[PDB]
Every structure is written in C-alpha cells, then in structure tokens.
Design an enzyme around this catalytic site. Structure first.
Site, short mmCIF file in Angstrom:
data_model
loop_
_atom_site.label_atom_id
_atom_site.label_comp_id
_atom_site.label_asym_id
_atom_site.label_seq_id
_atom_site.Cartn_x
_atom_site.Cartn_y
_atom_site.Cartn_z
N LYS A 49 -52.85 73.83 -22.86
CA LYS A 49 -53.52 72.88 -23.75
C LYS A 49 -53.76 73.56 -25.06
O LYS A 49 -54.34 74.66 -25.10
CB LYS A 49 -54.87 72.38 -23.17
CG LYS A 49 -54.73 71.28 -22.14
CD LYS A 49 -56.04 70.95 -21.41
CE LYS A 49 -55.78 69.97 -20.27
NZ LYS A 49 -57.03 69.56 -19.57
N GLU A 109 -52.63 68.60 -27.72
CA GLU A 109 -51.36 68.51 -27.00
C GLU A 109 -51.34 69.37 -25.75
O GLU A 109 -51.98 70.42 -25.71
CB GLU A 109 -50.20 68.89 -27.93
CG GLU A 109 -50.06 67.99 -29.16
CD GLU A 109 -49.06 68.43 -30.20
OE1 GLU A 109 -47.95 68.86 -29.82
OE2 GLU A 109 -49.36 68.28 -31.41
N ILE A 110 -50.62 68.91 -24.73
CA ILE A 110 -50.45 69.60 -23.45
C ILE A 110 -48.97 69.97 -23.23
O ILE A 110 -48.08 69.12 -23.39
CB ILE A 110 -51.15 68.88 -22.24
CG1 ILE A 110 -50.83 69.53 -20.89
CG2 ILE A 110 -50.89 67.38 -22.18
CD1 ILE A 110 -51.95 70.16 -20.27
N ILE A 138 -45.68 68.03 -22.49
CA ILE A 138 -45.83 67.09 -21.36
C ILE A 138 -46.76 65.90 -21.63
O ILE A 138 -46.88 65.01 -20.80
CB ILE A 138 -46.05 67.78 -19.98
CG1 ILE A 138 -47.38 68.57 -19.94
CG2 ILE A 138 -44.83 68.64 -19.59
CD1 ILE A 138 -47.84 69.04 -18.55
N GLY A 139 -47.40 65.89 -22.80
CA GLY A 139 -48.28 64.82 -23.24
C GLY A 139 -49.32 65.28 -24.23
O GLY A 139 -49.12 66.27 -24.95
N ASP A 188 -65.26 60.66 -19.50
CA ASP A 188 -63.91 60.17 -19.77
C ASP A 188 -63.11 59.96 -18.48
O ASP A 188 -61.93 60.30 -18.41
CB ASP A 188 -63.22 61.14 -20.75
CG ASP A 188 -61.93 60.68 -21.41
OD1 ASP A 188 -61.81 59.47 -21.70
OD2 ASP A 188 -61.04 61.56 -21.67
C1 LIG Z 1 -54.43 62.05 -20.85
O1 LIG Z 1 -53.67 62.85 -19.94
C2 LIG Z 1 -52.33 62.58 -20.03
O2 LIG Z 1 -51.85 61.59 -20.57
C3 LIG Z 1 -51.54 63.67 -19.41
C4 LIG Z 1 -52.20 64.79 -18.95
C5 LIG Z 1 -51.51 65.85 -18.38
N1 LIG Z 1 -52.21 66.97 -17.94
C6 LIG Z 1 -51.80 67.83 -16.91
N2 LIG Z 1 -50.67 67.67 -16.19
C7 LIG Z 1 -50.38 68.54 -15.22
N3 LIG Z 1 -51.09 69.60 -14.84
C8 LIG Z 1 -52.21 69.74 -15.57
N4 LIG Z 1 -53.16 70.72 -15.43
C9 LIG Z 1 -54.16 70.53 -16.34
C10 LIG Z 1 -53.86 69.41 -17.08
C11 LIG Z 1 -52.62 68.91 -16.59
C12 LIG Z 1 -50.13 65.80 -18.30
C13 LIG Z 1 -49.46 64.69 -18.74
C14 LIG Z 1 -50.15 63.64 -19.29
BR1 LIG Z 1 -49.02 62.20 -19.82
#
Ligand SMILES: COC(=O)c1cc(Nc2ncnc3[nH]ccc23)ccc1Br
Length: 292
Positions: free
Chosen positions: A43, A27-28, A20-21, A134
């Site tokens: 994560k 990485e997530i 997801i990113g 951050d």
């Molecule tokens: C820097 O953060 C990002 O760019 C990003 C972060 C998340 N993080 C999350 N997105 C959705 N639920 C989450 N729970 C904990 C973290 C988290 C998802 C997508 C991006 Br695209």
C-alpha cells in the site's frame, strides 16, 4: 499515472509486480518480497496527499497482530515521494466475488458464514480500542493459500479511529464529526454527522448481509450523500428483512437501540447467525458459492 512503476524496488526488498487497485486514499500493489520470496501486498500513498491514512493503518495492524481475520504485518516506511505499508497478500474481495455471482446474490449459506467471520473481525478491532468506520464488501477478502482460502480477512484500516483513551476508558464523542466511509453502508448516524461508535460498524455489517442475500439495497443507484441519508431515514428498515432469516429482527432491534456509549451485545448477533444456520441445516464445513 501510478505512484510506482512496475519493477520498482521499495527499500531494496519489495519489487513491484503490478497495481491491484486502490482509488481513494492511495494505491495497492502486488509485490515480490526479495528477502522471503513471498508475494505480498504493498500500500502506497503520495507524500503530497492532503489526507494521510497510512500512519493509522500501521498502528491498528500492529495492535491486531495475533488476531484472526487480519493480514500479517511485513513492514512500513516513508520518504519524500511516498509512504508505504507491506502486509500479507490475500485472494479475491467480497464485492468482486458478489458481482461475479449469477444474480449478484450469495446463498444464505455463504451470507451467514461470511457474517460470522466479519462479526468476529469487528469484535476484534473494537477489542483493541478502535472503530473501523469503513465496513464494506471490498474491505474483506478470502485467503489465497490452501490453509487460508476458507478464511475471510479485514483488509484496510485507513479510516479507523481510537474510541478508547490512554487509561482504557471511552473518550467523549465530538459534537459533530465529518462523514467517514462508504455512502452505501453508512448508518443513519454517520449521515447525520454524529460521532461514530461500535454500533455504526454493526449497521454496515447489517446492510452488507442484506445486499449479499437480496442482491441490492433501496439506495443502490443514488450517489448523493444527503439523498441516500434521506432514503435511509425514511425507509422502514423492517422491509429489508423480507427475504432474510427471521432472527434478523433481533439483530435490527439490537443495533437500532444502541448509541455511541453502549457496548454492543456481539453474542446476541452471533446467536442470530448460528440459529439461522442450524434452522436451515447449514454446516460450517460447507463450500462457498465461488467454490461451486
Ligand atoms: C477497496 O479495496 C479494493 O478495492 C481492493 C483492495 C485490495 N486489497 C488487498 N488485496 C489482497 N491482499 C491484501 N492484503 C491487504 C490488502 C489487500 C485489493 C484489490 C482491491 Br480491487
């Protein structure tokens, strides 16, 4: 290539659905929790990565449990290939939501209501003895459930640092500190390699809300850390208040007067947002721009 392929199962419990990113520091992934049946956020960071942020992530996340605007802690672990943290999954992030706006700006109604929620997040992390360092729109996201879609959450704690010590006192700042966080929302103090304080997280909040309401910051196009710093140092910050509510002068004057040692007046900043809302007939129950 990704650290984890699709359908990988972490510790016989978390099945990787998709990436997801992530980017910098790891990485997530979106994962299916095979024990709870709940979709979760996973994560991961390579065990052969020089800077290991995930140990901090866990420590702060555990300390913040019970507090509003934080993901529920699900699990964590480490192996020879990678380290991981599992936590509550949320909806879209504020940088994505802002970029999806017609003019890349939110209304003052959305801006002020997000400001209140982000300020409560900052106050909460500082209350457990940690600095975020951050603060940026991509570190905040709305909920994805019917009971959470109006709530804003603080997503990551990788660059966090304890400002208190074992006895509950403020620890001495280092004479110099390496630059931490985004270049865009960093305070002038961070650019000068000074030890970051509670006030520096409030500077990031200030810049973020100007970008939310105006759609841009004077240093938007500049990527060089030093160049951005020179702009911020030279830029008459009152000019940033041109299209902002008038009480924002009080917010700017307050943070500009703080240093590493002085506890911020969070209530003063909250009153700026609350008065900016009442003076515009903005109700707390209003719909956000993305709901329109
Ligand atoms: C820097 O953060 C990002 O760019 C990003 C972060 C998340 N993080 C999350 N997105 C959705 N639920 C989450 N729970 C904990 C973290 C988290 C998802 C997508 C991006 Br695209």
């Amino acid at each position: 290539a990704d650290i984890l392929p699709a359908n990988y199962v972490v510790k016989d419990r978390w099945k990787v659905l998709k990436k997801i990113g992530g980017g910098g520091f790891g990485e997530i992934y979106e994962a299916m929790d095979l024990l709870t049946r709940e979709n979760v956020a996973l994560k991961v960071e390579s065990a052969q990565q020089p800077k290991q942020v995930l140990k901090m992530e866990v420590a702060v996340l555990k300390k913040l449990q019970g507090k509003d605007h934080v993901c529920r802690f699900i699990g964590c672990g480490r192996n020879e290939k990678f380290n991981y943290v599992v936590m509550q999954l949320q909806g879209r992030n504020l940088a994505d939501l802002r970029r999806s706006q017609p003019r890349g700006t939110f209304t003052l109604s959305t801006t002020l209501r997000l400001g209140k929620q982000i300020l409560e997040s900052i106050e909460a992390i500082h209350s457990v003895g940690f600095l975020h360092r951050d603060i940026k729109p991509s570190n905040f996201a709305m909920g994805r459930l019917p009971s959470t879609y109006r709530k804003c959450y603080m997503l990551d704690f990788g660059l966090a640092r304890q400002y208190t010590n074992t006895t509950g006192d403020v620890r001495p700042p280092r004479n110099v500190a390496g630059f931490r966080g985004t270049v865009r929302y960093a305070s002038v103090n961070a650019h000068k390699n000074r030890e970051m304080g509670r006030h520096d997280d409030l500077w990031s909040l200030f810049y973020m809300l100007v970008e939310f309401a105006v759609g841009q910051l004077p240093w938007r196009k500049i990527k060089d850390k030093e160049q951005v710093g020179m702009i911020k140092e030279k830029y008459e910050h009152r000019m940033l208040l041109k299209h902002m509510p008038s009480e924002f002068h009080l917010f700017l004057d307050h943070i500009a007067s703080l240093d590493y040692f002085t506890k911020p007046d969070y209530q003063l900043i909250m009153s700026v947002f609350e008065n900016s809302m009442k003076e515009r007939g903005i109700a707390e129950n209003e719909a956000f721009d993305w709901e329109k």
